[model samples]
Target: MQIFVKTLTGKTITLEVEPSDTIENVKAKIQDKEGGGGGGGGGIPPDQQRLIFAGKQLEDGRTLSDYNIQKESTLHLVLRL
Candidate 1:
């Protein structure tokens, strides 16, 4: 399934993840899409990204289903830097 990651910066990132895929997977995907595309280092690394869903802070090892996230649910990235 798919999940929408709203960074509150501009556009949201579309992350396609399996139920078994966790936050680490999402972080990797985000970096890959935003940074690995070209010569631009526009992507934020996983360490700087803090995501929470349903008001609960998500851990890297936590699965989407573990947080009650579905295809239509959104996970917000509240950045610290």
Candidate 2:
């Protein structure tokens, strides 16, 4: 499944990871793109991040279908400041 993710800096990226991929995977990909020395000396902290799908927070360990997310759905990541 393809998911649309947006960064706190207003950058939008398309992720084509497996539908089974967890929210953490998305964060890791973002971090990989941002590089290690980008900020905070590491990627965005998963604990401080919140993912909202269809206007609701995606439960931890839930699959895309588990949350009723359809193909090409938009997932927003509210990154901590």
Candidate 3:
């Protein structure tokens, strides 16, 4: 399934990843796209990126379905920095 992700820098990126993909995976992909790897080299700090669903913040390691994500759900990516 395709997921819409927003970065801390206010950039939006659409990715077609597996529905089983975790928030960690999404973070990694965002980092990769920004040419960052390991540590805080990524544009967005790992601790500051938030995956929001249904107006709630998602805990780490939580899957999409954990928050009842649907095929066309609009998951908001909020920057915490």
Candidate 4:
């Protein structure tokens, strides 16, 4: 499935993942797109990144389908400060 994500900084990224993929998996990919810093030093980590879809925060353990995420679904990314 393909998911559209918009970051707090106004960056939009497209993610290709399986429907069975966990939010954590998506987060890992997002982290990679963000340069794979993994929250080291001043970098943002998966835990610090929040994925919101349909006005709800996505849980790491949950699958994209669990949140009713579909192809072209747009999710907002909020970075925890």
Candidate 5:
């Protein structure tokens, strides 16, 4: 499914996700997109990106379905820097 992550940086990114994917997986993707990667990193590391949906903070071990995050869902991202 396609979802929107609204970041505190004032821009939103559209990500393709799967129900079986964990929050950690999503975080890594965001990092890959804007956070640079591997030591080349706000440039929020996966461990530093905070994700929220439906007013609940998402956990790294939890799957998107755990949050019931479906197609076109909006996830609020708070930079942890």
Candidate 6:
């Protein structure tokens, strides 16, 4: 499934993931794309990235299907400082 993720920084990323994929898996991919950086305006660590869908915070162990996410679903990414 293809999903859209909008980051706190206002960056939008397109992700191709399986419904069986965990939220942690998505976070890892986001971290990879953002690269390893710190400080202001830098890539956030996966542990500090919060994914929310349909006003619900996604759990690391939970699959996308568990959240009932559909194709083209939009996920909000909150980066913790």
Tens digits of lDDT, candidate 5, 1-81: 899888767778999989899998887776666754345432545666789898988877789998788999999888666
Give one digit per residue, the lDDT tens place, for model 3 in 1-81. 767666666787776666677777766776676664455533557787777767788777777666666565656667777
In angstroms, the error of model 3 at 3 is 1.2
TM-score of each: 0.78, 0.73, 0.68, 0.82, 0.81, 0.81
Clashing pairs in 6: none
Off by over 4 Å in 2: 36-43
Model 4 CA lDDT for position 39 = 56
lDDT of candidate model 6 versus the reference: 0.83
Ranking by TM-score: 4, 6, 5, 1, 2, 3
What lDDT score is found at residue 36 in candidate 5?
49
Off by over 4 Å in 1: 36-42
RMSD of 4: 3.0
List model 4 lDDT by residue over 1-81, tens digit each: 788889767999988988888988887777667765445655666777888998998877799989878899998988766
Which 10 consecutive positions of candidate 1 have the poorest summed lDDT? Answer: 35-44
lDDT order of candidates, best first? 6, 4, 5, 1, 2, 3
Q: Give the TM-score of candidate 1.
A: 0.78
| Residues 1-81, model 1: lDDT tens digits | 878888646568788888778888877776665654468445556787788888888987687778777897788887757
| Window of ten residues with lowest summed lDDT in model 4 | 35-44
**Candidate 3 at residue 18, lDDT?**
66
**What is the C-alpha local distance difference test score of each model?**
0.76, 0.71, 0.69, 0.81, 0.80, 0.83
In model 1, how large is the Cα lDDT of residue 55? 89
